[PDB]
Amino acid sequence: SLDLPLDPLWEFPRDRLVLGKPLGEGCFGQVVRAEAFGMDPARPDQASTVAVKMLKDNASDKDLADLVSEMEVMKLIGRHKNIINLLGVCTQEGPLYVIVECAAKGNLREFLRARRPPGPDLSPDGEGPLSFPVLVSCAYQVARGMQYLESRKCIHRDLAARNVLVTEDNVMKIADFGLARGVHHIDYYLPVKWMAPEALFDRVYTHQSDVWSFGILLWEIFTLGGSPYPGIPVEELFSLLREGHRMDRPPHCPPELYGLMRECWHAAPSQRPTFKQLVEALDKVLLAVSEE
C-alpha cells in the first residue's frame, strides 16, 4: 500500500540514480552506493555519488512504515553540515528509496584506526594525517552536529565514533539522529561503555546524557579509535563508575581536553557542560592551534 504523496521539495526520479556497490546490509533492509545525476539542480547534468537506503527482498509492513517515518523526520529536522543529510526520495514509480549523503572515508573509528602510526612515538607525551588540529577539528564538528540535533529535539541512547561518518574532505557527519517525533533511526549496516549512568540504569536519555557519551567519543578521538575502559569487562564497569572511576588521560592528549572529558563525566547531569559550552571550548583550542 505504498501511496505517499509526491512531495515536490524531496521527490527525485528513478531514471536519474544508478545503483550498485552495496555499502551495508542489515536485517530486512540495506544501504547501497549510487551515482545520482543533478542532485544539485543548479548543476542538472553533473553527477555525484550518494547513499541509497531501501528495503530487502524479505519485505515487511512495519519496516516500510519505519523507513517512511524515518525519511519524514529527516526533512523535519532540516540540514546541517555535520549530520548525514537527506538528499531526495523515490516514492511513486517503484519501491521506497531514501537518498542520503555518502561518506567516502567510512566511520570515524575506522577512519582513525586506519590512519594510526605503526607503534609508540618518540616521546610519551606531547603534521601527518592525524594532526592535533585534525583531531581537534573532528571533536569540534561532532559537537556542532550534536548542538544542532539537540536544537531539533533529537534524543539518543548514546553517541560513539562508529555513529559518526567521515567524508572525502574530513567533514564529520553524525549518522544516527536517534529518536525524534516518536520515530527511531533505523540502521541498515547495548554500547554500555558509552552510556551515561542514568541511561544505563534509570533509562533517562537527555541532552546531559549525550554530553557524557561525547566525553567517551573525545577519548576515542584522542586515542585514535581506542576501545574505552580497556581490560575492564562490561559486567562490573558500572560498579567502578559508582565508586568514582573514570578513564585516564590518553598518552598524547593535552590536560585542557582531558579537562573536558572529565567535565563530561560528572555524576550529576547539571554539573556536565552543555554542547554550547563544548563548542566554545573546542573552538578556543582550534584557534589556539592555528595561532603561531
User: Measured between alpha carbons, how far is 125 from 237 in angstroms, rounded to an integer?
Assistant: 27
Per the listing, cell 523535519 goes with 76
**All CATH 3.30.200.20 domain ranges in the chain, comma separated:** 1-102
DSSP one-letter code for 83:
B
**Nearest C-alpha neighbor of 156 from the set 257, 83, 225, 75:** 83
Q: Which three cell numbers stand for residue 216?
A: 567517551
Closest by Cα among 190, 195, 233 to 212: 195
Which of 139, 171, 165 is CA-nearest to residue 286? 139
Ramachandran angles phi, psi of 243, nearest 5°: -70, -25
Specify the fold of 1-102.
Phosphorylase Kinase; domain 1 (3.30.200)
Closest CA to 104 of 168, 48, 23, 162: 168
Question: Is-contact 47 37, C-beta < 8 A?
Answer: yes
Helix (H) or strand (E) holding 24: strand 17-25
CA 84 to chain CA centroid, nearest Å: 8
Query: 103-287 architecture in CATH?
Result: Orthogonal Bundle (1.10)
Could you list the residues known to form a binding site for ATP, using ranges: 23-31, 53
Q: Which of 63, 158, 176, 210 is catalytic?
A: 158
Nearest to 89 by CA among 4, 171, 194, 164: 4
Catalytic site residue 158? yes
Q: How was this structure determined?
A: X-ray
C-alpha cell at 203: 533509562
Q: Cβ–Cβ contacts within 10 Å for residue 90, how many? A: 21
Which residue type is seen at 164? V
Alpha helices in 99-236 (DSSP H): 108-114, 132-151, 197-201, 207-222
With beta carbons less than 8 A apart as the criterion, state whether 55 and 28 touch: yes
Determine the Cα–Cα distance for residues 74 and 177; give it in Å rounded to an integer: 8
Q: Are 224 and 113 a contacting pair, CB within 8 Å?
A: yes
* CATH 1.10.510.10 segments of the chain: 103-287
Give strand pairing partners of 99: 52, 88
CB 214 within 8 A of CB 146: yes
Rounded Cα gap, residues 31 and 280, in angstroms: 35
Annotated binding site: which residue ranges? 23-31, 53
H-only helix segments in the chain: 61-77, 108-114, 132-151, 197-201, 207-222, 237-243, 255-264, 275-290
- DSSP-assigned beta bridge partners for residue 82: none
Please check whether residue 193 is in contact with residue 166, taking contact to mean a CB–CB distance below 8 angstroms: no
Longest dimension (CA), the chain: 64
C-alpha cell at 250: 590518553
**Structural contact between residues 154 and 80, judged by C-beta atoms closer than 8 angstroms:** no
**CB–CB of 118/107 below 8 Å?**
no
Distances (CA, A) of 34 to 31, 67, 69, 190: 10, 19, 22, 31
Contact between 112 and 130 under an 8 Å Cβ cutoff? The reply is yes
The Cα 292–Cα 16 span in angstroms is 49
Residue type for position 115: R
